[PDB]
Amino acid sequence: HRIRITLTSRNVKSLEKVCADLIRGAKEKNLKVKGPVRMPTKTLRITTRKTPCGEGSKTWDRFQMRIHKRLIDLHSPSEIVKQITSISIEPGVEVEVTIA
Amino acid sequence: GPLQSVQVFGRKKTATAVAHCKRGNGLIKVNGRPLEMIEPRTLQYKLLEPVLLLGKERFAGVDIRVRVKGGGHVAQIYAIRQSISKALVAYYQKYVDEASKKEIKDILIQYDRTLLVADPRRCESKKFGGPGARARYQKSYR
Amino acid sequence: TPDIKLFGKWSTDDVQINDISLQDYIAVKEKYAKYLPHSAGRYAAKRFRKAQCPIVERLTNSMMMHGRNNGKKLMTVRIVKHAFEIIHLLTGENPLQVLVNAIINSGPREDSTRIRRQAVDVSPLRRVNQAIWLLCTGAREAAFRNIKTIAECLADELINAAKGSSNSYAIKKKDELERVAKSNR
Amino acid sequence: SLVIPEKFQHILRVLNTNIDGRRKIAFAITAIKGVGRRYAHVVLRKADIDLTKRAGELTEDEVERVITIMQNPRQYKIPDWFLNRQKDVKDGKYSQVLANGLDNKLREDLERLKKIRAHRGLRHFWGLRVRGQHTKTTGRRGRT
Amino acid sequence: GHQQLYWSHPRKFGQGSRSCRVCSNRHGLIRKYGLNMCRQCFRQYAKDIGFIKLD
Amino acid sequence: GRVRTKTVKKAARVIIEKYYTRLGNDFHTNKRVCEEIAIIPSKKLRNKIAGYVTHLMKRIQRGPVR
Amino acid sequence: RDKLNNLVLFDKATYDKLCKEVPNYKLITPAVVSERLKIRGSLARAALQELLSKGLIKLVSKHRAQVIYTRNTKG
Amino acid sequence: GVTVKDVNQQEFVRALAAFLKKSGKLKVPEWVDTVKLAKHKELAPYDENWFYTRAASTARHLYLRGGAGVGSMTKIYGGRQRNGVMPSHFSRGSKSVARRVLQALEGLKMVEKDQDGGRKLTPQGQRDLDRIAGQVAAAKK
RNA sequence: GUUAAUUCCGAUAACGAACGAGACUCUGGCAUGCUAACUAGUUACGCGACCCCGGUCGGCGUAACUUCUUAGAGGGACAAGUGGCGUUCAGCCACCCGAGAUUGAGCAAUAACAGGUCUGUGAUGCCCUUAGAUGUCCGGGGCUGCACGCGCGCUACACUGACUGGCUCAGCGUGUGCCUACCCUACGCCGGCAGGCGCGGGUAACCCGUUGAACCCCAUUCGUGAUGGGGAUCGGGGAUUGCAAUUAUUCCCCAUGAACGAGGAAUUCCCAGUAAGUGCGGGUCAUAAGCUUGCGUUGAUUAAGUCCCUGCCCUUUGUACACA
C-alpha cells in the first residue's frame, strides 16, 4: 500500500510540471500523500579539449549535464497508482514505480 | 514552562555553526566540550570576546550548545564566534526588551562586523590554463 | 574587562605617539586594539582601508613570507606574542610603545625615484610600510641560519630600532637610503 | 651528572671507523657503514641501553656487548626485515653486515654480474643508470 | 594452425581492446559513464547526447 | 562603470511618455508599475529601466527635459 | 669557512660560570645561553631543566620551540 | 561529576597511559619495541611505551564514536606519505598494530565487538574513563 | 565631456537602422517567509550506560518542525538616498541603511591567416601500393637509448625547520561496464609492510562516509655540522596487476648517502578569500599522477596610477610599402 514514485529528469520546469500534476492528481483522488522529496542534483562534468589536434592554446570545455531526482510516496493500492501514472506522461521525466 | 529554544546559524565559506540557546545556568559548550579546550588554543580570547565584552551576568542565565560541521579550524572558530553572538542577539530580541538588544548590537557593531555579518567571500574557481583562480602557467618564448 | 581591552596582558592605553605625522596611520589607540592580532580579512579591499588595520596585525601579516611560511597566521601570532614577551623582559616598558618608537625611528623620511635619480619625500603610510618591511627583513636575515630564534631576532631588531644605536638592519638600510637620497639630489 | 665524567672518549674505535663522541649514540652508530638510523634504534632498543646519553659516557664492556649484538643479529632477537642481505647468494644466511663486508659483497655482486655478462653488469661497467632511468636529460655533472 | 594463431592475443585489457564507437580508433577515448567514444566525436554529438556548456 | 544603454533609455522614455500619470517618485512603486505595464523578460533589465525612470522623474522635478 | 666549536657537556669553569653569571642575566633563554657559553642548545635546555629543578630561575611562558626563563624576584 | 570533554585530552591520554603502566596486564606483543607504526612513518618512536598511550587514544576515540574497525583506525592514524623526490600524499596507518590494540582491549574488558562490525566501549571502560577524568580534574584543581 | 565599451549627453548633411559590446544563461553568499522531506537533521521525551539535582552519548525509538541539509517558485540592487564635482545632461567620488554599491565562467561582430589536424572518421578529391602488400595477424625490439643545450613541472638548500606521539577540521566528486573479459569497499583473522582469506552493503543523500585529508595546535629529541635538511645513485629481499617486468611496471623493508649554503644576464604570473603553502576527487588506469581539470584548508605584501618598456584602439600628418 506504500507505493513509491521516483521521478528522474534532465529538464527543470518539465519535472516541476510533472510533479505538480501528480500532486494535483493525488489531491483530487483524496489519499494520504507525503510531500515531494528533492534528492540533490548531479552535475555530470566532462572536461575535454576544444581542438581536435593538440596545436594551439590549451583550451578546455566544461560539458555539464544536470540531472534531478524527486520521490513521492503514496498510501494507496496499485490500481490507483497505475491509473495516475498512466496519464499525462512526457519524455523529459522517467518514472519508476516501486510497490514495496 | 514555555521552551525558549533559539536556533541561530552562522556561516563561514564552508563552516556553518548553529548555536542553540535556552533558559538555564551559565555554561557554554561546543559539541559537548566547553570553550577551554578547542584547538588551536591561541584563539581562546577570540572565543571569550563576547563574554569579556558583555559580562558574565548576560551569559549566566543562557546555556549554549553548538553543533558544528564544515570548514577548517579558523573557519569553525569564527563560525561559533559569530553564531553564539547572533544567537544571543536573537534571544534578547525575542524574549526580553528590544532596548538591551539594541545596545548589545551597538556594542558588537562598534567592535567588529564579524560578530553579526557573515563574510560573502568564497573560493574563486580555478580556470583552465592556470594552477589557480588568477595565476597562469609559465609562458616560454622561443 | 568590559571597559578596557587587554591585548593579551597588555593595556590599550599608555601609548605615546610622539610623531604627529603618524597619529592617523598608527591604529593602536582606543578603536582598533584587540585581544589578539589575528583576524579574518577585508582590510586590503579599498585603497586607504589598509591604514585602518592595526600595526600588530600588519606585522603579523608581513612576517609570513618566502613560500614555505605563507599561510601560517596563528604561527606568526605565536611569534609576535613571544617576541613581545622578550621585548618586555629585556626593556621593561610597553612592547607596543617599543614597536611604535621602532617605527618612528626606523621609517625613512626621504627616498630616491626616477622621473639619474632624484630624491623626494614619502607618504607617511608609505613610511610605515617601508619601516615594517625593513624590520621584518632584518629579523628574517638575523634568524636565517642562526641558533637565535625568530622571536629573539624580531625582539632584538625592534629594541635596536627603538634605541637607534645603528645596530638594527632596518636602521642600517634607513641610513643607507638616506645617504643615497642625499647623494642623488 | 651532566658534567664531563672521567674516561670520556672523544674518538671511539668501533669496527675500523672513527666515531665522534660529541654526537648522541643512536646517530653516532650511524657513521659506521652498513648501519643506519632505524637499525641503530632497533639495536639500542633491543639492548637495555638508555639512549639519552652521549657517545662518551658508555663503558668498554658495554660497547663490546654492543659490538657482539651488532655482529650477531639473529641471536639477540632482531627479526629478518632489518637485514640488508636477506637470502644471500653464497652462504644463504640472514645477517646484517658491517662496513667492510658491505662493500665486499657489493663488489662481489658486481663481479658476478661482470662474470655472467648481463645487461645490468654491462650498464655498471659502462657507468650508466641501471634501474631504468632516463639519461637524455639528466646525468651531466658526472660525465665532463 | 592459422585459426590457432589468428586470435591468440589476450584482449582482456589495455587501450587497444577498447576503441571508439564511431571512429573505432584507439586515441582520446572517453570511457567515462560508458560513452566509449573519442573526444572529437563527443564534441560533435554532445548536443545530441545532452551535454551542454552551461558554465 | 554604471552607464545605461539605448535599449534601457529609449524604452524608459516611451514608458514615461505613455504612462506619466501612473509613474511617481518612489522606486519600489514605479518599478512594479513598469513591471505591470511593460513586458520585461528579466529583473536586471527591469531594474535598469525603473532606475532610469526614477532619474528622469528627478530631472522632471528639477526642471524641463528636452 | 667557520665552524662552531660548541661544548657538549659541562666543564668545571663553564659550570661555575653558568652557576654565577647566568642567573644574573635578564634573558635566560637557551639560544642566548649557547651563544654566550659556547655550548649546545640542547645542553642549554638541559641546564635550564636542571635550574628549574634546583629553583634559581623563574619560568615565564613555555613552548615546544622556545622556553623563556628569567631571574628571581627582587622583593 | 565531569566527563572527558571537560578534561584536557593531551594530559588525559598520558594519565591513562600511566594507568596502564600501573595495571600492566594488557598482554603486549613481542614485536612492539621493533616495529614502525605506519608505512609512511620514518623513525622508531622516542618513547618506549607508546603502545599504552596509543591504547589510551584508542579508548578515548572509541568513547567519542563507535563502530571504528581496523580501516577507521588506519584512517585516524594515517598521515603524510613523503615519497621523496615525488610530492607527498596521504597514507593510512598500519593495520596490525591497531589490531593488536583491539585484541588487547578484547582480552581484558575495555571494549566489545558490536553488531554490523565495529568496536563499542563497555560500561566498565566508561566507568574507568570517567574515574580517571575525575582524577585529572582533581589534579588540575 | 563620460564610460570596461561606436556607452550615452550634446553639436552636426544627415535620417532610419543592423552585428558586437551591453543585454543573456549558469555559478556564490541575503531569506528564522512559501513548498517539501524515514535515502538529512533539530527540539522535547521513553529508556540504557557512566561521573558527583546536573553533564555527555553518530546507543536505540517516537510528538512536531526545517534553523543546520537539499532543490523549486520567488524576492533582493537599481547609482536607490544624501553631500560634493561636472553644460547641471551624459556621468564620477565618499557615506547612512544595508549580505553584496565593480564575483567568475560560457556565447562572443565583418574580414583574413597559404597557422594545426588527410595520424578522429566507412568526411573526401589527386598521386602511390595492392599478394614477396604501404591490407591484416603473430613473436621480439624500439618510441625510455646519451660527451650536449633548451622548455614546462616536482623536491630541497633548513631551527619560521626535521623526527616522534596526542588532538582536530571539507567539497567538487567517482563507484558492478552491449563487445567488456576489468567497480567502490565496511568488518574479523594471518603478517612489520605491500597484501591474502571470508561473509556483508551499495546501480548510489541508503554502503564506503558524520567522507576522522594535509599545513596548522600542543609536548620531548636535535643545535648551525652538508647535521636528524635533502633523497639522487646503488645492492639484497618480500607482494600486488598482467599471457609476458629484462631496460628495475607499481608498492613496502634494510643499507649505501652525491650535488644543493637563496642561484648571473635575462625572464613568468598576480593585486582579495587573490598570489602562495597544503592536501583530496575525475581523465589517462588491468597495474599508475612527478601531468591536466575541478574542490577544500591556511591565507598575505604592495597598488587603485602610467605610457617609461612591450603592445592595442581613435584623430592628424608623411610615404618612393601594398607577398604592406
Curated annotation (Swiss-Prot), chain B:
It is found in: Cytoplasm; Nucleus, Nucleolus. GO terms for molecular function: RNA binding; structural constituent of ribosome. InterPro entries: Ribosomal_Su5_D2-typ_SF, Ribosomal_uS9, Ribosomal_uS9_CS, Ribsml_uS5_D2-typ_fold_subgr. GO terms for cellular component: cytosolic ribosome; cytosolic small ribosomal subunit; nucleolus. It comes from the Eukaryota. One of its GO terms (biological process) is maturation of SSU-rRNA from tricistronic rRNA transcript (SSU-rRNA, 5.8S rRNA, LSU-rRNA). Keywords: Acetylation, Cytoplasm, Nucleus, Phosphoprotein, Ribonucleoprotein, Ribosomal protein. SUPFAM superfamilies: Ribosomal protein S5 domain 2-like. Belongs to the universal ribosomal protein uS9 family. Component of the small ribosomal subunit. Part of the small subunit (SSU) processome, composed of more than 70 proteins and the RNA chaperone small nucleolar RNA (snoRNA) U3. Component of the small ribosomal subunit. The ribosome is a large ribonucleoprotein complex responsible for the synthesis of proteins in the cell. Part of the small subunit (SSU) processome, first precursor of the small eukaryotic ribosomal subunit. During the assembly of the SSU processome in the nucleolus, many ribosome biogenesis factors, an RNA chaperone and ribosomal proteins associate with the nascent pre-rRNA and work in concert to generate RNA folding, modifications, rearrangements and cleavage as well as targeted degradation of pre-ribosomal RNA by the RNA exosome.
Curated annotation (Swiss-Prot), chain C:
The modification Phosphoserine is found at S123. The modification Phosphothreonine is found at T1. One of its GO terms (molecular function) is RNA binding. Gene3D superfamilies: Ribosomal protein S7 domain. Pfam families: Ribosomal_S7. Keywords: Acetylation, Cytoplasm, Isopeptide bond, Nucleus, Phosphoprotein, Ribonucleoprotein, Ribosomal protein, Ubl conjugation. GO terms for cellular component: cytosolic ribosome; nucleolus; small ribosomal subunit. One of its GO terms (biological process) is translation. It is found in: Cytoplasm; Nucleus, Nucleolus. Component of the small ribosomal subunit. Part of the small subunit (SSU) processome, composed of more than 70 proteins and the RNA chaperone small nucleolar RNA (snoRNA) U3. Belongs to the universal ribosomal protein uS7 family. Component of the small ribosomal subunit. The ribosome is a large ribonucleoprotein complex responsible for the synthesis of proteins in the cell. Part of the small subunit (SSU) processome, first precursor of the small eukaryotic ribosomal subunit. During the assembly of the SSU processome in the nucleolus, many ribosome biogenesis factors, an RNA chaperone and ribosomal proteins associate with the nascent pre-rRNA and work in concert to generate RNA folding, modifications, rearrangements and cleavage as well as targeted degradation of pre-ribosomal RNA by the RNA exosome. NCBIfam families: PRK04027.1, uS7_euk_arch. This is Small ribosomal subunit protein uS7.
UniProtKB/Swiss-Prot annotation, chain F:
Component of the small ribosomal subunit. Part of the small subunit (SSU) processome, composed of more than 70 proteins and the RNA chaperone small nucleolar RNA (snoRNA) U3. It comes from the Eukaryota. Belongs to the eukaryotic ribosomal protein eS17 family. The chain holds residues 2 to 67 of 135 of the full protein. The modification N6-succinyllysine is found at K18. This is Small ribosomal subunit protein eS17. Component of the small ribosomal subunit. The ribosome is a large ribonucleoprotein complex responsible for the synthesis of proteins in the cell. Part of the small subunit (SSU) processome, first precursor of the small eukaryotic ribosomal subunit. During the assembly of the SSU processome in the nucleolus, many ribosome biogenesis factors, an RNA chaperone and ribosomal proteins associate with the nascent pre-rRNA and work in concert to generate RNA folding, modifications, rearrangements and cleavage as well as targeted degradation of pre-ribosomal RNA by the RNA exosome. The gene is RPS17. The lineage of its organism: Eukaryota, Metazoa, Chordata, Craniata, Vertebrata. It is found in: Cytoplasm; Nucleus, Nucleolus. It comes from Oryctolagus cuniculus (Rabbit).
UniProtKB/Swiss-Prot annotation, chain H:
The modification N6-succinyllysine is found at K141. The modification N6-acetyllysine is found at K21, K109, K113. It holds the Pfam family Ribosomal_S19e. It comes from the Eukaryota. Keywords: Acetylation, Cytoplasm, Host-virus interaction, Methylation, Nucleus, Ribonucleoprotein, Ribosomal protein. Component of the small ribosomal subunit. The ribosome is a large ribonucleoprotein complex responsible for the synthesis of proteins in the cell. Required for pre-rRNA processing and maturation of 40S ribosomal subunits. Part of the small subunit (SSU) processome, first precursor of the small eukaryotic ribosomal subunit. Component of the small ribosomal subunit. Part of the small subunit (SSU) processome, composed of more than 70 proteins and the RNA chaperone small nucleolar RNA (snoRNA) U3. Interacts with RPS19BP1; the interaction is direct and mediates the integration of RPS19 in state post-A1. Interacts with RPS19BP1. This is Small ribosomal subunit protein eS19. It comes from Oryctolagus cuniculus.
